[PDB]
């Protein structure tokens, strides 16, 4: 068995084709000095099989993806060259010997040792997860390997950067096999969820949320809005961000006027107009006093339309007035009436059925605190025309006086809470919204600025979840205003009847003993009514001095305790 025979067989074992046979290539005579080097040289063939089985087993199934092809088709350009070396080595066999082969094939024992160990580290990875497992072989430092693998990465990461440059400038992702880290669902809240598993390693977790926001910004700009058109890599993402988003607001403010609805939804749905809601409470007065069973929606709309024509709300954009309507909650007419301002379309992604479920949760509190005031300016109007008639009965002003003090003590608590609603809830929490809108952008700093604008008003007003003990305490004070308005006209009218009879009992004649008992008993019923206003007041003060104690519980409420307790009329 000559040495030229082993060199003939070795030149085949370098490819897989077997004296040398097939995990080491056990050779089967010859001298020990030859078997040792043959087994060492053949270990380059066993490395050529493992790299060939992968590029042949995975080149069979059609469910390995698009990235897994650019890899399996980049392990072939690094084999044709290994087939060129075997070409040259065979032409000289016709001189070279074993101890001469070692230097010839000392370098391709390394490339066939990175590639034969690069296909095992990434076995089950498909899609982008494979382009992230051939990048974890670049942190090696070896100038020969880090300049080989950093080339296969430049081929494997070409399909990945093909979806990216497609999902960013056109917003049309298409991958039958799930490779891209943006996974659609057959609009803003759903249908576009990041994939934590298929993000390449060479892309930071924050950069992966600027593409999913750039693609969504263009896909939403087409369908719903109904409109159609390294370091340089980081600059490309930001260049596509500061242009697409800035354009999304322009089409959302000129074609739909998203801002002109926020201002218009404060004037009406939050009573920010004042002029219009005043006239609207005078026209619904004869209707809502009836029970709810006799109330039908089709009648009230004519009243609402009348108010918008009478007040200053007529000079207004016709579009926003098309959505302002009524809705009936499902008692009395003052318990089921409320405005809705329904909004549908592209503008509906800012309100999202929750801002419309919070505004009505707020509108109830602003409607109650508005009728509890127009009652107390009706009473205070009655007293200015009351004393202009019965100022001639000096025996009645003793008890009529307690009717005035209880009023001026009750209108303060209400006319002060109105200011805390205006200045410390509306004018203050809205200012932090119009300030974070004229400077925000990308429509995702607007939603987050408008969503927190509804979490402070619910908190600054007593409509929270843990402030329940406070609101139910306030309702009792809201009730005592009604009981006064019922115990007032009873004492008011009872004095007008006795006055009217006293007018006719003397005008027709100008008998005398049968009326002095009627006039005499009328004076005796006065101390009975005085015991009402003496016990109604002493209970009204017992529910307010208890109300203040509950405010000392969550910080902005302290500005309310000062409004009520000015000059320390309470707290002794």
């Amino acid at each position: 068995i000559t040495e030229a025979a082993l060199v003939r067989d070795i030149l085949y074992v370098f490819q897989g084709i077997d004296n040398i046979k097939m995990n080491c290539y056990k050779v089967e005579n010859l001298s020990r000095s030859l078997r040792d080097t043959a087994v060492r040289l053949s270990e380059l063939g066993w490395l050529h099989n493992k790299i060939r089985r992968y590029t042949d087993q995975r080149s069979l199934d059609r469910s390995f993806g698009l990235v897994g092809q650019s890899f399996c088709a980049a392990l072939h350009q690094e084999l044709r060259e290994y087939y060129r070396l075997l070409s040259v080595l065979h032409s000289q066999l016709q001189s070279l010997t074993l101890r001469r082969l070692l230097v010839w094939t000392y370098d391709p024992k390394i490339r066939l040792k990175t590639l034969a160990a690069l296909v095992d580290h990434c076995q089950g990875r498909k899609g982008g997860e494979l382009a992230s497992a051939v990048h974890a072989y670049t942190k090696t430092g070896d100038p020969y390997m880090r300049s080989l693998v950093q080339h296969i990465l430049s081929l494997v990461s070409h399909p990945v950067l093909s979806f990216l440059y497609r999902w960013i400038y056109d917003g049309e992702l298409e991958d039958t096999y799930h490779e891209f880290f943006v996974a659609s669902d057959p609009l803003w809240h759903d249908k576009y969820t990041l994939r934590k598993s298929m993000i390449p390693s060479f892309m930071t977790m924050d950069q992966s949320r600027k593409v999913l926001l750039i693609g969504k910004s263009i896909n939403f700009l087409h369908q719903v809005c109904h409109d159609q058109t390294e370091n340089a890599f980081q600059g490309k993402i930001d260049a596509a961000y500061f242009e697409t988003s800035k354009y999304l607001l322009d089409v959302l403010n000129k074609k739909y006027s998203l801002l002109d609805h926020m201002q218009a939804m404060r004037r009406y749905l939050l009573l920010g107009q004042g002029d219009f809601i005043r006239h609207l409470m005078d026209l619904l007065k004869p209707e809502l006093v009836r029970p709810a069973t006799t109330l039908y929606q089709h009648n009230l709309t004519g009243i609402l339309e009348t108010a918008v024509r009478a007040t200053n709300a007529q000079f207004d954009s016709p579009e926003i007035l098309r959505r302002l309507d009524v809705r009936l909650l499902e008692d009395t007419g003052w318990d089921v009436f409320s405005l809705d301002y329904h909004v549908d379309g592209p503008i509906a992604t800012v309100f999202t059925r929750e801002c419309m479920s919070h505004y009505l949760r707020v509108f109830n509190f602003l409607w109650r605190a508005k009728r509890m005031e127009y009652i107390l300016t009706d009473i205070r109007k009655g007293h200015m025309c009351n004393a202009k008639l019965l100022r001639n009965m000096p025996e009645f002003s003793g008890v009529l006086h307690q009717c005035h003090i209880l009023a001026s003590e009750m209108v303060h608590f209400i006319h002060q809470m109105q200011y805390y609603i205006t200045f410390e809830v509306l004018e203050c929490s809205w200012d932090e919204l119009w300030n974070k809108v004229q400077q925000a952008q990308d429509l995702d700093h607007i939603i987050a600025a408008h969503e927190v604008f509804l979490d402070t008003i619910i908190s600054r007003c007593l409509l929270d979840s843990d402030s329940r003990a406070l609101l139910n305490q306030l309702r009792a004070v809201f009730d005592q205003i009604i009981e006064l308005q019922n115990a007032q006209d009873a004492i008011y009218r009872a004095a007008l009847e006795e006055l009217q009879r006293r007018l006719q009992f003397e005008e027709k004649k100008k008998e005398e003993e049968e009326e002095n008992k009627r006039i005499g008993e009328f004076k005796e019923s006065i101390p009975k009514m005085c015991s009402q206003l003496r016990i109604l007041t002493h209970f009204y003060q017992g529910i307010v001095q208890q109300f203040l104690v509950l405010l000392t519980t969550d910080e902005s409420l302290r500005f309310l305790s000062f409004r009520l307790d000015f000059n320390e009329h309470y707290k002794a």
Binding site: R8, Q15, S70, R80, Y83, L86, H90, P159, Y296, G302
Partner: protein
């Protein structure tokens, strides 16, 4: 006898034998077996040769299955695409007959050892492995026409990162789509469709929704986005003709934009053809004058002449008698200045508005090119909202007639004013606030038209609104409510005191049934403000 032959020399005998099989002709040792072609080499050969030979032959078997696709798919029974796909797949086989020619010359000097062959054919083993996969995925599912061009747009996207088998499948698609794209330049820029073999996406037939129909199979799946504007383009070209360059690129849409630059002209010639010549807006006003009852000085003169001959029952009146009065009604009236007045025909409907008087309605006949807009499907609608206005016009025409008979027993005066103030407050709403403003929208809504299938939308979008805002869409209480009005005119025409009050309790109850249902809704609400104005009927 390669068994009794030396080792290093018999390898040179196989490489010349294996250099024929790559062409197709059989060899001395490496022979072929009858038919996916399977070969046999020899029983007695060196193990380190056959295991190397059998690695090359997958380029021979992948060639005995592509040259059989060329010799076959070039027949005439397959279309103009399975032809070009077989021609552009024949230029490659020539470039393979040269790469085996350069080897048969380089082998003469002995410079071609078997190990050297296994390197030179590496590119010819990968190219012949793409053409042997399209030639088996075109015959798996029978593809001809468009479906054999959808496959060559997906087998070209699956190789989106290979770049050595995508520059190939982009040479086949760019060549197997010129014949298909050469009829497309005849269907967009003109109306003619040649397509001898039935393969184009649009096929003609032998009133126009059935002529040209989109075929679903033969859509190239890259024109799927514009599968409608293609058909909508040529169809516009035919309704004008009978009366009086595109290339393929990938990742560039130089053709997608090119179709729109023609479709936007294909419509602009047809839409303008209907507005200036054989005008349409000056043609619909010839319908409003009669059907929507806009001309007054014509109806007050027609019903005055054809009244006695209308109260007669059905199948008793001769149409030669009515039409003679209709012609005389137009010319004597102020409708004489109407070029299209000669298209009014009498049409006695068999069914009432679910006889004699309740079975009269105009009919309008139009020519071909305008019949696309106003057709029998969308003209009976004009004829449905006409009788509803001819009925309400007839009653208060005679209710105003009894007004003079009684004026030279005295409690019917305040009841007549209750029905007159009802129909004459319905006519004003039915005309000046339902059909007058809605039509005024259409006139302006036709100045901004862009294509005919839009005008066909601004028209039926106007008829479904008139039939909705009116009581024509149920609300049958109006039908029975109208009976007591006309019948009350008959009682007063017979010149009792217990019958006038009988009509009151019957008509007033029917009226309150109306406002009860007209109010319960989500204009249909402003009608109530037209019925009562002085606060009456507040119950």
């Amino acid at each position: 006898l390669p068994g009794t032959l030396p080792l290093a020399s018999q390898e040179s005998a196989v490489v010349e034998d294996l250099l024929y099989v790559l062409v197709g002709v059989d060899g001395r040792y490496v022979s072929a077996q009858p038919l996916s072609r399977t070969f046999l080499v020899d029983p007695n050969l060196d193990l380190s040769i056959r295991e190397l030979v059998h690695r090359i032959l997958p380029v021979a078997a992948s060639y005995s299955a592509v040259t059989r696709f060329i010799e076959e798919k070039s027949s005439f029974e397959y279309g103009q695409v399975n032809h070009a796909l077989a021609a552009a797949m024949r230029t490659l086989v020539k470039e393979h007959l040269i790469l085996v020619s350069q080897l048969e010359q380089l082998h003469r000097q002995g410079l071609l050892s078997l190990q050297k062959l296994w390197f030179y054919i590496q590119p010819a083993m990968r190219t012949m492995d793409i053409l042997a996969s399209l030639a088996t995925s075109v015959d798996k599912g029978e593809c001809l026409g468009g479906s054999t061009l959808s496959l060559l747009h997906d087998r070209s996207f699956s190789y989106t990162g290979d770049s050595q088998a995508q520059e190939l499948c982009l040479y086949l698609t760019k060549a197997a789509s010129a014949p298909y794209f050469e009829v497309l330049e005849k269907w967009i820029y003109r109306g003619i469709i040649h397509d001898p073999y039935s393969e184009f996406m649009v096929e003609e037939h032998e009133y126009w929704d059935q002529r040209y129909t989109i075929v679903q199979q033969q859509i190239p799946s890259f024109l799927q986005k514009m599968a409608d504007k293609i058909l909508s383009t040529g169809k516009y070209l035919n309704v004008v003709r009978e009366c009086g360059e595109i290339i393929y690129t990938l990742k560039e849409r130089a053709y997608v934009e090119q179709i729109e630059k023609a479709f936007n002209y294909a419509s602009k010639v047809l839409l303008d053809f209907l507005m200036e010549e054989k005008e349409l807006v000056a043609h619909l006003r010839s319908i409003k004058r009669y059907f929507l009852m806009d001309q007054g000085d014509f109806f007050v003169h027609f019903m005055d002449l054809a009244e006695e001959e209308l109260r007669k029952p059905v199948e008793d009146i001769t149409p030669p008698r009515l039409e003679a009065l209709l012609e005389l009604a137009l010319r004597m009236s102020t409708a004489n200045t109407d070029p299209f007045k000669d298209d009014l025909k009498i049409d006695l409907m068999p069914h009432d508005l679910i006889s004699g008087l309740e079975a009269f309605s105009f009919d309008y006949i139009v020519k071909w090119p305008l019949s696309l807009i106003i057709n029998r499907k969308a003209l009976t609608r004009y004829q449905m909202l006409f009788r509803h206005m001819f009925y309400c016009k007839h009653v208060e025409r005679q209710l105003c007639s009894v007004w003079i008979s009684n004026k030279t027993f005295a409690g019917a005066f305040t009841l007549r004013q209750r029905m007159l103030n009802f129909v004459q407050n319905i006519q004003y709403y039915m005309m000046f606030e339902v059909m007058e403003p809605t039509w005024h929208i259409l006139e302006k809504n036709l100045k901004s038209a862009s294509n005919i299938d839009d005008v066909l939308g601004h028209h039926t979008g106007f008829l479904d609104t008139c039939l909705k805002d009116c009581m024509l869409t149920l609300l049958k209480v109006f039908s029975k409510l109208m009976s007591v009005c006309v019948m009350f005119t008959n009682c007063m025409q017979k010149f009792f005191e217990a019958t006038i009050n009988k009509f009151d309790k019957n008509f007033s109850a029917h009226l309150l049934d109306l406002l009860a249902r007209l109010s319960i809704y989500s204009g249909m609400a402003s009608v109530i403000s037209r019925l009562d104005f002085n606060g009456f009927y507040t119950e």
